[PDB]
Every structure is written in structure tokens, then in C-alpha cells.
Amino acid sequence: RDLYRNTNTFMIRTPIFSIDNYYEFFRKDGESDKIKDRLLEICNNSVFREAILVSSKSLYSTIIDFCDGKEIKKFDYFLQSIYKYLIRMSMRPTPFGLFSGVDFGKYAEETVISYENDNFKKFARPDLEWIIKIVKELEDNHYKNLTFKINDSIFIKGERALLIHSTDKEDNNRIGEISIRATKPFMRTYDLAKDGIEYNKLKYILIDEYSIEDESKIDNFLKQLIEREFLISNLRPPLTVLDQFDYLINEVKKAEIEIPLVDELTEIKEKLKLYNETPVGAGEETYLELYKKMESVANVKNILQVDMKLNLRDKKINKKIISDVNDLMNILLDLSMSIENPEPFLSKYKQEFIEKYGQDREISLLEMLDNDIGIGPPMNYERPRNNRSLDVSVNELLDNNVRDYFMEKYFQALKTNSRNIAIRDDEIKNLELQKIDYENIPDSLEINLLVKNKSEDNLSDEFQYYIGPNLGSTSAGKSFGRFSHMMSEPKKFFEELDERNIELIDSEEYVTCEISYLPSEVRNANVTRNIHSSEYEMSLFTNGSKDNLYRIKLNDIYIGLENNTFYAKSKTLNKKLLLTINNMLNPQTAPNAIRFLNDISLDEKKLWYKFVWSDVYKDFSYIPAIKYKNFVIMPETWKMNKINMKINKKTEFNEFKNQFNDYRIKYGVPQYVYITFADNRILLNLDDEQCVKILYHECKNSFNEIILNSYEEEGVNIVKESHKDYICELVIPLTKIKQESDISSLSKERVKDPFDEWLYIKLYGISSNVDDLIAYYISEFCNELVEEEIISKYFFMRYVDPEQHIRLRLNSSQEKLLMIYPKIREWLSMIRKKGLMTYFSIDSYDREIERYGGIELINIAEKVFFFDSIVTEDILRAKREGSFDFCDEIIGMISVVHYMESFGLPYAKQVEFLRSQREDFKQKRTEYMKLCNSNKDWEGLRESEEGNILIEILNKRRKIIEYYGNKVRENEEVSTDLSILDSIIHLNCNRMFGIDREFEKKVRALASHALYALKHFK
Amino acid sequence: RDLYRNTNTFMIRTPIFSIDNYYEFFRKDGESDKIKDRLLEICNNSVFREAILVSSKSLYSTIIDFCDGKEIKKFDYFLQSIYKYLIRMSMRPTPFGLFSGVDFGKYAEETVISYENDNFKKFARPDLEWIIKIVKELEDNHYKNLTFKINDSIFIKGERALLIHSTDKEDNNRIGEISIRATKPFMRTYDLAKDGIEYNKLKYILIDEYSIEDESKIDNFLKQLIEREFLISNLRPPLTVLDQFDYLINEVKKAEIEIPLVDELTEIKEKLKLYNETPVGAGEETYLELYKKMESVANVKNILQVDMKLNLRDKKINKKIISDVNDLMNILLDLSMSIENPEPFLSKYKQEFIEKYGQDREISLLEMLDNDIGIGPPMNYERPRNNRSLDVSVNELLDNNVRDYFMEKYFQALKTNSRNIAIRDDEIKNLELQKIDYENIPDSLEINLLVKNKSEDNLSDEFQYYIGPNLGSTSAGKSFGRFSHMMSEPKKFFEELDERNIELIDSEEYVTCEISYLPSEVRNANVTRNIHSSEYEMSLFTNGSKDNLYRIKLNDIYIGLENNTFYAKSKTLNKKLLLTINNMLNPQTAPNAIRFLNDISLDEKKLWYKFVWSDVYKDFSYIPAIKYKNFVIMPETWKMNKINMKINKKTEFNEFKNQFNDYRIKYGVPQYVYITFADNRILLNLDDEQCVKILYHECKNSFNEIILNSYEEEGVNIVKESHKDYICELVIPLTKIKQESDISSLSKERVKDPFDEWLYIKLYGISSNVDDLIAYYISEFCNELVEEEIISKYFFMRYVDPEQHIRLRLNSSQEKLLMIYPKIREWLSMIRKKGLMTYFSIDSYDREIERYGGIELINIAEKVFFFDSIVTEDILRAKREGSFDFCDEIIGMISVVHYMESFGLPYAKQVEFLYMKLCNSNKDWEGLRESEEGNILIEILNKRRKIIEYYGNKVRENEEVSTDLSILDSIIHLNCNRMFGIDREFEKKVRALASHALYALKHFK
């Protein structure tokens, strides 16, 4: 079965020169091997010169001097640069500058890709580093004309206000939290600037309502907020519009400011329009005029960004490619089921969240991630690291059968001297792996493919695929967003993706939202400006493209768990958010909030390019190519270490050369390899290429990322111009086929200080005597205090920190509790002297209000816990006194059944409730069916006087549970009271038996079979 | 340079049959391949029959039927048993039964080992299961005649008393503690039976002093103590005497009991003497008579234990062997430095011990290991597991360069199709590993070697060595003690080991102590009775061999740390204990106390047979042999899994046979291999060998312990009888060459309850706003309580228990602390409402009495902490106001130097204990007082000076205090914590810079 379908279009990538320029440069067709000579004939190529100019203006100036014949001092460093760019212009399809370009194709019944005469169109635009220099300059002068909004990242925490990264930053301050004080005039500003205010309109209101007299005090105040980016002006362009520069000119035209600058920007816009029409190689002088004019307006290092479009004549591929890729995804998703814990840090974080907050609350995203008021971030987040000493250990738990399979594959490959390992469908089927569930399949993806034709002599589309060095991406659209200004109809592309996303998810519960973010170092944002079609937008440190009706704020995002998976909800909308980011922003370097919102959008989905064998082979210096059918998934690879290569920074060439030839002979390294960083394809039978090799080896300390990969050395290239071959990469986007409380964390209702109506004691060192201490000591003392009316009620339960303890909670007034504490000390000293305990502590009681039904019902649940304590004490005593001889399993079963009977869950439901969560251990059938039958009044149990004692104890608890059950059903705001019933059953088991998960599981199984067998009697 | 020297002697081990009996049974020289005929011929061999009789009387009875010509039921099961025993009699030197024997050799200038005609002596003696079956019967009938002692394993905990393993146990009970109530008449008996007492003398004291009037009450009391083994009778023999049965016959003569039993025991003793005189094979009829006599006295499964001595004529080996083993030990101890954390679980336990008890306390062994009053055992101990939910993840931290070295070795071996990997001294020297220290080299060891002539051509001692399957032992004499009754002069062997141990350790402080333990399942102890020459003995559940002067009791042992290594000490002796166990008792199944005492004796020593490459190759299904010079360190090995042998329990033979022949060719498995369990050497070219293979493989589910190892296929055997080869194994023992408080844990002095004169508050949620919370809020509130005289003093510090918090401690009376608690509540609510904290708790204050000098000086240290808190608040406030602008590093250095100066540690010591203008304290910090900033700083610090001088003089005045520099170091660590919190890097920097500045000032001091 096919799991994915294609979209309407795909991306084509291709370098500017054919492969012939590469082989011809290594003297393929000419005897000359002079160091210069050819070096002059490459610098006479105008397309090579213009490509260098747009990328590195320093290296350009050296090439001019070289053609002038001037002495160039380094020359060594000069050759390395020229060689590396000549290679990168012929061999690396990845699009950058003018070295490589992009185009968009369509699926067809045949493959044909061709170049037109009018190949290569330029798309130049201003760099964001340059634009934002002008924005700051203007608003630093003319702010009285501007309109301001509050920064949507703001968080207000007590008397402090915060932003997600440091602004107006300081080396003495970035060592800790940086914040402004939330003074009353700041809180007034926060309400006025909510949706934009004119500067003069804001100023006079503050001067009015605070009198001040000194006008300069308010000007100085507002300047601080603007300079620290708590206020954002209208001039700053959105990243989500199609043209940031046109936006800025429009805004300065609305303000009617700096009229001389408006003309200069218009002239720059016209010069830039002229430059984009010049063909490649003709633009050199035109670029320098524009670059000089822009440098005269704002002096920054980057100024211009340039892209180019291939402008192909034909651009069709045989849709057969989609049937092949669907085969690959099946085997990879099957293999993904062998890893049991693929995200160990996020999985640990769920346990911390549940232990703090339970299942029934939604928590503010910014509170939750805070170190002081939250639980902090996951332990692998490096922005504001978690300051707690938590355990960082992890294990993904690979299946030992799959570890064996790949190790036998490796051994057989070495023994037979095979350069590749092949996996096969029927070999994987024999592994007996668990099948993937549909909800775990990822909803869209992108894969990068190099395509070569396997034989022209068969006159057929026999294609060989290699997965590209970057593999792909986790969502369709991320690779395309960077080129939205080059697409003919970008809105129609993203509307399709948005429609298919909405089609795959639950209707009416979800809305789509885009995340947009401008970092402090704005060079990084030049790849982060893109179009989108999500309904809502959250724009941080920038103006948004959306109207204020569709604007979202970080302090409005609440996080919850459902089905053990995280979701995000907007409180103002009361909608769940489906979150998108249409660009290749790296999550691991973003602030923790953005990284977390990225992570949870992929929660419980498989990551398709996380390969199982990666951990099996991580220690080998050599790995064969891994392939499936006609896909090469990973290339053949070699790496270098201090054992196999013996190199120092004091080592020298010729000495390295001898040492490296021994490596090539020992490991079989072929003539062509990639050096897997930015140096790429190296020809080893050429001494200048080994000079690149040694310089990298020696900077990389002879180990660091010195990884060699084989070249794609079979098949032939599919893209041709006349007779010249071009190397070509496809990006294929795929979409999944569809298969049919307001109580705050520190409210005084939730958290009770010591002696604030409750005294909460932890008793340590109890494990050897737990049952005698409960049944005798605690029972007598607390039941005496109840009769003297000193306390109204108590309950206890057993827990584990490191070390086991009893938790004992007493309820009264603060006055009465402080009055008796001296007698509690004497009591606990007497217990210690007998050796029954070691030490104790007093703690804050944190009330689980939402779990037991809200602020009304938890008062009744705390009475239910009081009566269940008494019954437990009485059962433990009668058991110790020998008054009956039932096993622990029988007492558990009877207690569970008596709970459901008194809570009022009718028999038709009971079995299904005790299911949904011992077959040969039922062999006591007659005993269990006799005892668990509640009919008449436990008639089968009352048969023996031992059983009569037992039921007369349990019935002390009955009437309060009935009352609690009726109120839970009487409440219309509470639903699935079966979750409340389940919670109180766990606590009774804890009280009687302690922590034993297998024991509790046994009691619930062993009682579903007796209730089932009583079907004929109900 | 040689690290080890030989002892006077070594052990020789040899099977009872020559290897020719193996090849002749697989038709080496025979055309016939019938299963019978040969099956009849071996069953007519008298040595084989008696060997089977001594080991399994069941199978012996089947052999007799088979020779009587009856038809056996199983027959197939009959074949595999006879094959397995014939092979084990021919090929496995490990001594057991009559299958194999032992002898003791001496070193010489040349090797010659030869059998005499008088070979093979029997050494039969009774089994302990039978001895103790008889002992229980007598002490049940005749207890009134016996003398009794307390069980030396006893522990008393509050009102309960406990033993280290369950007695009179119950399957419901064994899951938890089992104990007797320590009632007053028990505590009286515990004093009376200290040195032993007669039953009547004990009974009538108790009856009198408790005036019980009903005599039967005390009888029924003492019977329960005896049945539960809280009392031990004189009849029960020591495991550490030479003959347990002669001891038992002697004690019943002293007691005069049951004289009709005593003559029967004496006659059993006589018949046993005659049996030991019979040659092997001649004894079947005499064994059955003695066996049936003994079974008539006590019916139990085992009854008799038998060994045999080889009685070699010649037994010299060339002393050259000792030089080769020194080379092996050099290269192995060199490799051992590549692993940083080889005992991961015990290192965690050292951290938990430092956390709970610190560096200055000695803790009772049975308290420390207790789950409730102690910290429990290490997390890998299986006898009462640690019930705490700790993280058990562990890592040994192998050096990445050595992993690379071994991985390129393995790749190169597979590529060249080589069957072995060789390690070399110069290759290891290029790894640039750290050098092993002399204190880490283990004091003694034993190594097992199979020895072959590399060739006969020279008639020369060119030897090839294979390390035996069990490798060796951690201590000299562990392999030997099991044969103490067969040695000619056992005391002279064990005396020289004790003397060599006493010579290696520190004089005067140490004594040697033997641990002896009898388990509840006594069959396991038949290998645990041995002689020793240690000065003291601890005997558990048994009588000892020593007088009461030299008896040690388990509740007398205290544990401490020194130099980050554990030691054990006796409180009565006031001596450290050098602990010995001269037998192969497995520590991993012993009670937690015995396992911990074993682990102590090896702490911070290397374990020589823990091979580094064992972790690197653990995932591979084939491994070449690892060798060095002329040692094969590990054999070549293959293992089977569900990928390479697709077999199931439903799989039939023939299909297995075709499946396996494929595996052989793919992996190159040779003709002879060991199946590494109790089936051992297999000839794969023979079909019944394949039947043994498949039978094992099916039960082992095609995975469990199915490891194949190659045979020692080159060289020739060195032991000959005329012209018959025997396989021979040596055990070489070696010894290292020498290179020249009374305050209990729950005393009211130590632990203070909440409001018990101390109020101890932990404040959470504070990490964003420390320094402001200290300098303003805590400062202004607590100092105002001192002015009111509501509290006498306070101090604070910063800690982590996962979450960061402040620890704030206030001192007053209980009545005053309960009176003001409402205002403390109002105070902390206001701090919370500003968002400066989240929640708080009240905790017990556990005072570090021994760290700060004992019960008197601790009261002064707590005043030093009070004045140091005030100075920290003042410095933090002045910094926040900007009254000075020094770096944190400057303030740290000045405070450290001011501490040493005011504590009175002179300059000549300061640079040994650990900018120039500021740290020069001369005149009156005159270089600092020059600026106004420096005058403000120094005036704050001088608030602290007077109390530190007073404290320092009292420390030096108390002659009971030693290394007062540890007190100064402690209080300097606290000052840094208050100002900067927890950052180990920053303090290390601050101290380093201060030392450099003080050293540069030598001309000025």
C-alpha cells in the first residue's frame, strides 16, 4: 500500500557549469600542467569573475591584481580558494549566490529536462543587515512620527518583565536573567500600546495621569523601552511579506519623514531593477555602482543578497518516481519500530510534567519552561540550561535481534569483500517486528535525490537514486519557502499544503498558525523570510503581516497532555494550534520556547531519516554503502583517527603524502571522494588536491569531521545542454494519504503553608515496621485527637522519594495545630526510641483540585480519604490479630468490588471498566466466584463469621462513597467520573499494600474474571 | 622489572585417563563404527564403574542392568551420559570425584614430571549434610547436656534482634525482615551465654531472677532460641579444623550422651579407614557396605565426599616460567590504566557515604548496610536489594584511543583472514597511557596455565601457555585451601602466606582475620572447609577454631574512609583488619555483609583478569584468539543466535544437521571445539557429538551459553607415563615484591527536631533573585529578631536537592519559636507575592559534630557562621549600591587571605596550605586602605575577625583535634558558598590566584 501522494510540483537544482569544465581543468585534454597558465584562463572567464564578486569582494580584488601581474604575497592561500570555487561551481548543486540555481518542474508521463538559450536569471535584493541599519537610524531620530506596538514575546512575572533574548545586552548582565521593572506607568503603557498608538498620543496620557511636571522624564522613560525593543515601531518590515524593501519605502512615505532619503531609496530601487536585467557575466560594473551607492546610504558588510533561476525549457519527470519512493518509506518505517525510546530527553520530560501537574491541567508555556516558577526545560536544551542536578542518562533500547542482523551483514560484507550492504523486504519480515500504527506516521516530508540514468542503451527510464547529503526535511514546504520570490505563483503552492493539513486533522478543534522570529544577529534571518498561508501568525520582534484579528501572543499559549502526547492551545481563541514554520531555521539554536513548539509539533511521530543502523556502526572507521533495490541510502565512508593516520601540526608534506598512500592501499579508498565539509569533491591523483586534504587534516587536528565519502560513480546525468551534462538534484514533497480551570499555581486554595489549616508530616525509616506502626501507633493517637475535637479529620498514604516514608496529614485551625505540636514531638520521640522510625519533616500540602472534581468536590474527596484510612487500619489490625485468614489478593478483590458497588457503577459497566487496562491463576474459581458475589448483601461472604467480620469493617466506608458518587454525577462540568473512580481505587490499594504495580495489576485482572463468570448471576 | 615472586610450591592437576583413551573411543585405529561393543567394553572397565559409583549411584545401577543384558528404557539418554563422562574422564583436568586428581610440585632447573606405579590415592570423608543431620538429632534429644553460645552474627536493633540469613523461615516471611523480640530475659541470656554456658546453669539463673514458678516457661523459651539458631551448641564442628568428623566423635565423648550411637560412629570411622587403603577400581564392594552403614545411621542424599591424589614420582618445573608470567602481568597492568571507573557501583556508594556521614565518622557495618537505620547496600547487591529508587546507570569510561586500537586490530584480522590478534609492548607504549602506581598493584594472585612443549626437537623447555578457562583467583591460597587435608604439611604453606601479607602492610596497625560462614543449605559448604593461619577468626553459625581471646564478632566491625578507600576496624581491638577467605566461596551469593567485607579487601586494586577489550568485542559473533608472545590469553570463539542459526524447539534433527553444516563452513569452525558448559570437548565429525550439540542447543533455546571455543591444538603434552600423554594444568601462586566518636547517629545532641531549639527553613524558587533576597529581605528580618532578643543567632547557606534553595537556620527556645511562627508565615507570604519565592519546608537539623571539632567546638563554629552571614549581607549590599567596584575574583582572594591571617596560619604555611598590591596584608592592609573603596571593604571584613581568632585558638588548644587545617579548609569552603553559591570552577580559580599572589610577595609577606 502507498502511504504518500505527490503535490503538484517539485524543485530542480543544478550548478552553473557542466561537469566537463571539471575534467578539462585537470589537464584531461592538454599536456600543460603549469601552476599558472590555466590559472590565467580561468580568471579570464567573466562568469567566474562575477560569481566571485557577488560572493567575496576581497578575493575579487586579488584576482584583478593577478591579471595586472602584481605580486601577490600568499599565492598558496590564493590557489586553494580558486580551486575550491572552480570545483564548487561544477559539482555542488546546492543553490548559493551565482554558483547554482533553482527551478520548478511538473510530473509527466516522460522525463525531459533541457536548457534554453536564455538560461540563468538574476534575483538580487537588499540584505536584512542593511535594511535594519536604516530602520534603527530613522527611528532613533524621528520617533515622534512613528506608531508603536508591544513586543509579542513579552512575559510579566511578578514585578519583572522579560523578553526571550537579551536586548541592549551587557556582558555583566547576560550571566543571569535580564528584565525591566513592571512599574505602574509601564503597566499603563502595556494597555495603551496593545494594538498600536501614536507616540504623541501615548506621551500626553502619561504626562496627564502622572502629572510629572518634567516632560523629559517621560521622554527618557519611553526611549528606554524603545531602545530595549519592548516597543516595536511600524517601520520594521515583516519577514512574512513578499518584499521587505518595498514595505519600508511605503512606510516612510506614510510618515512623511526624511524626504531626501526617500528619493535616494527610490533611485537605489531603480538601479537595482536595472541590474536584475543584465545577463550573467555582464553585470560586474553595474554591481559596483549600486554597491557604492548603497554603501553611501548605510555602511554595512553585506548589503546585497543574490539568487538565480535556471530558466529551463523542459522540466518534466516520469511520475514513476513516486511509486519508487513509496517503497523506500515502507521499509524505513517498518525498521523504525525496532527502537523503543527514540526521544529519551522528551520522554523523561513527560514524567516530570505528570509528577508536577497531573493529567487534568493546562499550564502556560512560559511559566512551565521557567526555572523558578516552572519545571524548567528538557535537560538537553542549551539556551537557559536547566539549573537542576537531574539525571542526564538515556537509552534508546534497540532490539537485540536487529543489532544482530546488521552485525552479521557487516561481517559478511568484510569477509566477501563487498563494497555494499543490501537490505531486503523478506529479511526484514523475518524479524517479527511490531507493525506501525497510522497515528504515528508523519503527515508530510521532503526527500532530496540525485538522479542518474542507469542505461541509455536500454532506451528506458532505468534510474539510480542517491539520497543527498542533507537527506531532506521533516515537513513539506520548508525547503521551498526561501525561494517564494522566485516562484511564479507562490500563494497557490502554500494554499495546497494548508488545505491538505486541514484535511488530515480533526475539524473545528484546530487552527493553523505560523511562527515568525527575527534574531538579534540578523544575518541569520536572510533565509527565514518566506510566504505562508496559515490562518494565524505569531511574529516575534517584528511587525506581522496579519491584521490584529489574527495576531497571536506567546503569553496566550497553554500546554497540556492528552493520550500521553503534548498539544498547544490558544486561550483567547479556545482552539488547539497546528504550528508551521516554512523555512529551514535550525531549532537547536533557537530560544527554548521556539524549540519546544517545534518539538511538540512532531511528538510521537517517526523521524524518517533517523536510521536504525547508525548506532550499530558508530565505532567503525570503515562502513560499506547501504542500499535498497535502486536507492543508495548512505554512501561508502572512511574516517581517520590517531591509530590509522599518525599526524601532528609539526608534521610536513611529503611525509603526510607517504603516510596517506599507505592508508589508501590499506582501506581501498578510490580515486574520487568528497571531503565532507565545504571542501567537497577531491581528486586524489592530483597533488594540489592533497594539499587541500592536508590543510584540512591539520586544522581538524587529524580527526575532527575528517570523513571521506565515495562519489556517485555509476550511471549518467539526465540533464543535458546540446552535448554537455549537468549534475542534478530533485526535492520531492510528499503528503500522507488519509485513512478514515482558573485556579493559579500559587493560589492559597491550592498550596497550604505548614500549619495553614493543615499539618503535613513525612515519617522516614519506617519500612521494616509499616503495618504495625499504622495499625497500632498512628491509629490510636490520631483517633484520640479526633475524639477530643482537636482535629476534624486526617488521612495517610505511602510514597517514595529516595527512601520510603509515610505521608500523614492532619486538618484543623492554625491555632489548635500550634497548640498540640509539643505533644506530637513527644509522640514521635517515643516512636523513635522503640526503633520504629528515624527522622521527620514538615511540608507544604499541594492540593490536587482538578483531579477530584474541582473546588467544591475535593472537600468531599478529603472525607472519603478519612474513612478509607480508618477501614485500612481496622483491616490491618484484624489481619495481625488473626481474626481472618484470607490472602491479600482476596482482600484486594473484595475491596475493589465494594468500591464500584458503593460508588454506583452498574454491573453492565464494571467488567468493561476493569478491562480496558492471570487466566490460569483463576483456578480457585469456586472460591472467587463465591466471595465476589455481592447479591442480597454479600450473601456468599456472610456465610462464615470470618467473612462477616470483614464486610462489617468495609461498610464503615460505604455511605460517604455513595454521597461522593451522587455529587460527581450531579456536576455537569465534570465528565468521565470513571477517571475519578479509578483515582480513588489506586489510593486504597496504596494504603493497604504499598507501592507494587504488578500486585495492583493482578488484583484488577483477578477481579474482572470473577465478575465476568458471574454473568449468569450479575 | 619483575613485580612478583613465586612461593615455595605449585599445584598440578591431571585427568585419570590418558588422551589415547579418547581417540581410541572414536575409532582412531579401528574400522568398526558400531555404537555397542565399545559401549560394552567401557562398562566392563572397573575404574570407570567405580568413578561413576562415587559420583552417581543412580547411573551406576543402570550400568549393572545393562551388563546384566536387560533392556534400558531411555538408552538414548544412557548413551549421552556415558559419552559425557568418558570425555570428562579423559580431557578435563579440573579435579572432581575420581575423574581427576591433584598433586603439589616444586621449582627446579629443569622440567620432569612422571607417574609412579603407586598412583592415585583415595581420600574419602563424610559430607557435611550427614554430619549436620546427626548433630541436629543429638541436640534435639539431649540439649540438657550441651553447652551453648550466642550466634556471632546477631544484631540488636531497637527492640528486635536479627541474624544475617533466615532461620525457621517461612516463604511468606522470607520476603521481609525476620526477628525475635529482644525481651528482658533475652538480654540477660545475651550476657550470660557470652563466653558459653551450660543449659542447667543458664536455666536456673533465669528461673530464679524472673521467679517464673512455672519451670516449663523457660524450657519452652530456650528451645525456641535453639531451634532458631540464636544459640549454638558445642557439638557443631568448625569449618576451620582439619577433621570435622573426629571433632564430632570427641565432643559426644565429653558429653557422655547416647553411647549406643558412639560405638556405631567409631565403627564407621574404622571402615572408612580401610576403604581409603583400597586401590582405585578395587573398592566398589567396600563402598556399598560403608554407604549402607552410614545410611543406616542417617538417611540423606550425599553422605560421602571423595578426592584423589595423583602421587607423582617427579614433579619439577623449570623456574623460567616465573619470568614469563611477570611479562604478562606487566602488559596487563599497563592496559588496565585505560579504564577510569572500573568499579562503578562502589564509587556511587562512596559518594552516598560521603554525603551521609562525611569524612570524620566510623559507622557500624550492620547499621550502614541496613535499609532503614542506614543507607542500604550498593545498588547491585541482591541479598536484600536496596529498596530506594536510585538511578543505576553506570559507565566505565574506556579511553577512545584504546577502543580505536582494538577495532583496527579486529578489522585487520578479518581482512587478512588471520585466526589471531597479537598485542605488542611497543604498540602499547605508543598509546601514552598513565603509569600504574605501586599502591594499586594487587598484593597476590593465582594464575591457571595449561603447558605444552612448543616442539620436542630440542628436548628443551620451549613452552606454549594457554590460560585456563577459569583464569585464576584474586588471592594466593584461594585455590589451595580446599585440599588442606591432602597436603603433607599444610600449616607451613599457609604460614608463609600470612607472613608475606604482614610484611607488605603497615606494621602495628593491622591484624589478619579469617571469615568463616556456614550457609543454611549446607551442601554448598563442602568446598569451604580449610585450614588458615590468620591470627583472629570470625565464625558465623558455627563454633570457631580459636580461643575466646581471638574470637571476633560481626557487630564489632566499624567502617571508615581514608584517602577515598574503605577500611574495616575492630572497636574492641582498636585495630584495622586485614581480611582473608582461603576458599572459593562465591561472594555474589553471600549475605550483604560478607560480600561487602570481600569488596573492601580489594578496594582500589586492579583485577588482573578484567580484560579491557572484553567490552569492545562484546557484540561480535566471532572473535579471533588474543595472544601475547607465547601466551594465548583467550581462545578463539564462536557463538550462536537467531540470525545465524534459525532453530526452534519444534525443529527436528537432520534439519539441524544440515543447518549446522552451513554455519561451520561460513564461520570456519574447526573439527574440535569445547561446548562451554559441562559437556565440553566435542568432535564435530561424529554424529552422537552432534546429538549432544542439538540436545544442548534446544534446551538453551539456540542462544543461552552456547559458546564454542577452539581446542589447544598445537604443541605436545609434558606429562608422560612410559609413552602415554596426560593433559596437565598448573596453578601458580605469586606474591608482590615490596618496594620501600561516642555520639550515636540518633543522639539528641546530633539531630534536632523542628522547633527543638532550632528552626530550619528551606526556601524554593529563589534562583532568579538571590543576592537581592539575601542583602535586603533576609537581612532586614532576621537581624531585627536579634535586636528584639527573640533569637540568639542565625546563619544561611545555598544548596541543591535537585532544585536550588536557601537553607535558613534560626536558634532560640522552643517556646519562642512557636510564638513568632505566625509572623514568619506573614513574612514569607509577602516575599512570595512579590514573586521572589515559591514554597518552603521545615526540616530536621543534623549537626556535623565531628567535622568542626567535637561537642564543645561545634558551638563556636555556629557562632563563626553567624558573623560570616552578616559580613556576606554587607558585602552584597555594598556591591549592589556600588560603594565599590572590585571584581568577584578580587573579593574572593581578599576574603581567603583574611581568613588565613585571622585564623592564625602563618605565611610560611599559607602557600603550602593552598594582584600583589591588594593581598599584601602588612601594617594594616595598607596597600588596600589607600582607596576609599578598599577602606570600605576592609572595614566590613574586620567585623568577622575577632570570633575567628577565638575559634582558632581553641582548636589548637584542644590536643584531641588533629589536622586543624581541615577545619580551616571547611570554613573557607562555606564562606565561598554564601557569596557565590555552588560553582566548583570559580573557587578553584580563586584559590589558585591567591596562591600565586602570596608566593610573589615572599619578599614582603
Residue numbers in the entry:
A (entry chain B): 2 to 741, 754 to 930, 937 to 1037
B (entry chain A): 2 to 741, 754 to 927, 947 to 1037
List sentences from the manuscript.
Maddinglicin A (MadA) produced by Clostridum maddingley belongs to a group of antimicrobial peptides, the so-called lantibiotics or in brief LanA1. The first necessary step is the dehydration of serine and threonine residues, which is catalyzed by the MadB enzyme in the case of MadA. The structure of MadB in the apo-state was determined at an overall resolution of 2.7 Å. MadB is composed of an N-terminal glutamylation (residues 1–741) and a C-terminal elimination (residues 742–1038) domain. MadB forms a homodimer as already demonstrated by SEC-MALS with a bifurcate cleft-like structure in the center.
Similarly, for NisB a RMSD of 2.6 Å for 1383 Cα atoms was determined. This indicates that the structure of apo MadB adopts a conformation in between the apo structure of MibB and the substrate-bound structure of NisB. In the apo state, the regulatory loop is stabilized by hydrophobic interactions with Ser154, Glu230, Tyr518, Ser521, and Phe542 as well as hydrogen bonds between the hydroxyl group of Ser180 and Glu178 (distance of 2.7 Å) and between the side chain and backbone of Arg229 with the backbone of Thr168 (distance of 3 Å) and the side chain of Thr168 (distance of 2.7 Å). Surprisingly, the comparison of the apo- and bound-state of MadB revealed a RMSD of 0.2 Å for 1792 Cα atom. The only change occurred in the vicinity of the substrate binding site. More precisely, a loop formed by residues 164–179 had to rotate by 8° to free space for substrate binding, while other minor conformational changes of MadB were located in surface-exposed areas of the protein and are likely not relevant for catalysis. Interestingly, only at one side of the apo-MadB dimer a tunnel of the GDs envelope was evident. The tunnel is protruding towards the corresponding ED of a monomer indicating that space is present for substrate binding.
